Design a protein around this ligand. Structure first.
Ligand SMILES: C=CCc1ccc(OCCC)c(-c2cc(/C=C/C(=O)O)ccc2O)c1
Ligand SMILES: C=CCc1ccc(OCCC)c(-c2cc(/C=C/C(=O)O)ccc2O)c1
Lengths: 9, 211, 211, 9
């Protein structure tokens, strides 16, 4: 969730 | 190619006691994502595998960071928030056992051998590239990345510290202690959440939640 | 001197699914004591340290044994009692998760690399000589014994398998998985005891009891 | 206990 948004950019 | 120079750049680029520990942990999770992006070839992995690796090693990755950061501290931990947690304060908070394990098994061992930041980065990259992580779309690819990490680390140790032939094996033999300490710290995290007495922030909460 | 030849002699000298697993574990604890006596210099340690080392590593020591013993088995474990436990039987008993971890992270990894009995003995001696064990009268002495173990192991790997330079690091990098699997297996042991449904024999019971 | 007796002989 938050990890996904941070791994994108 | 897995150059230790870039792994070092990643380490240098990211540079109530229980409540303060959780705050620092949540703050470093955001930094941990930036660090992993700087490890060669990590961003080239499938997004779902990147998530699996970080969710599986975020705890050991943070513990290895603040331990090495505290090698100069006397019987204490230096949190990423700038607060010094002394073993007496940790013992007075009820987490003295695991706190002592971190000092004896990690901080002190790092201090005695003068583990440099390049070796710390290599170890954190090794735990990052955990081929045993469940759900990996291609564990072999992750294992190949791990093999290139400890392949470059060994060559770096034999060149930087040629008079310490066993330094390479000594570095890897701290990972078992890192593994067990991470599991114990995670149990405390669940008890903190379950007891509801401790503030758990968003990112740290997300790590406490199931896949 | 820590000759791998003698370490090999030690390994060769000792050669309801849940209930059958506990029976085998209790039976091997007695054998584990005999094995440790054959590891060079272990019997020369203080009796209290010998007790600390075995109580601290008995579980990982047994798990490493039956895992390597099962490399030839297909999706199953070969207990020291001669009984074959298949992953389906283990899953039908409610212990399928940890049983799968043993297969993927230990047995299969051992089978893929053809880990020989000399390397298994060296790894079991490394876990035996755990300088992090709490209460050791002289942890440095135990660490010196561990250093001589993985010093002889590296030389053995570079001579036996000269075309596999990373085999030594690969061997040590299974210990983290061994550490976490041992902790999980131990939790199951406590739940078995706590639930009182499973027979726990004397020696295994003694390991479940506090220091 | 049992371990001690086995470590003796
Ligand atoms: C010395 C041991 C005490 C202790 C106990 C519980 C803990 O976890 C609970 C929260 C995850 C931790 C902890 C701190 C950090 C902070 C790191 C940083 O500031 O850089 C990260 C992960 C941790 O598991 C430390
Ligand atoms: C595959 C995993 C299932 C499983 C689950 C719980 C277990 O522990 C519970 C009892 C300690 C064990 C286990 C078996 C043995 C038997 C060894 C042998 O026969 O040589 C030893 C230690 C163990 O922890 C295995």
């Amino acid at each position: 969730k938050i990890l996904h948004r941070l791994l994108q950019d | 190619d897995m150059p230790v120079e870039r792994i070092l750049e990643a380490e240098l680029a990211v540079e109530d006691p229980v409540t303060n520990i959780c705050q620092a942990a949540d703050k470093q999770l955001f930094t941990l994502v930036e660090w992993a992006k700087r490890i060669p070839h990590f961003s080239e992995l499938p997004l779902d595998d990147q998530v699996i690796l970080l969710r599986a090693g975020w705890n050991e990755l943070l513990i290895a960071s603040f331990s090495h950061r505290s090698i100069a501290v006397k019987d204490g931990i230096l949190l990423a928030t700038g607060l010094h947690v002394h073993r007496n304060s940790a013992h007075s908070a009820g987490v003295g056992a695991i706190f002592d394990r971190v000092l004896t098994e990690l901080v002190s061992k790092m201090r005695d051998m003068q583990m440099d930041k390049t070796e710390l980065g290599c170890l954190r990259a090794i735990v990052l590239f955990n081929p045993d992580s469940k759900g990996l779309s291609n564990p072999a690819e992750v294992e190949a990345l791990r093999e290139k990490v400890y392949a470059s680390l060994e060559a770096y140790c034999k060149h930087k510290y040629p008079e310490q032939p066993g330094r390479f094996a000594k570095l890897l033999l701290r990972l078992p202690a890192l593994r067990s300490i991470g599991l114990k710290c995670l149990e405390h995290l669940f008890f903190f959440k379950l007891i509801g007495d401790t503030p758990i922030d968003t990112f740290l909460m997300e790590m406490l939640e199931a896949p």
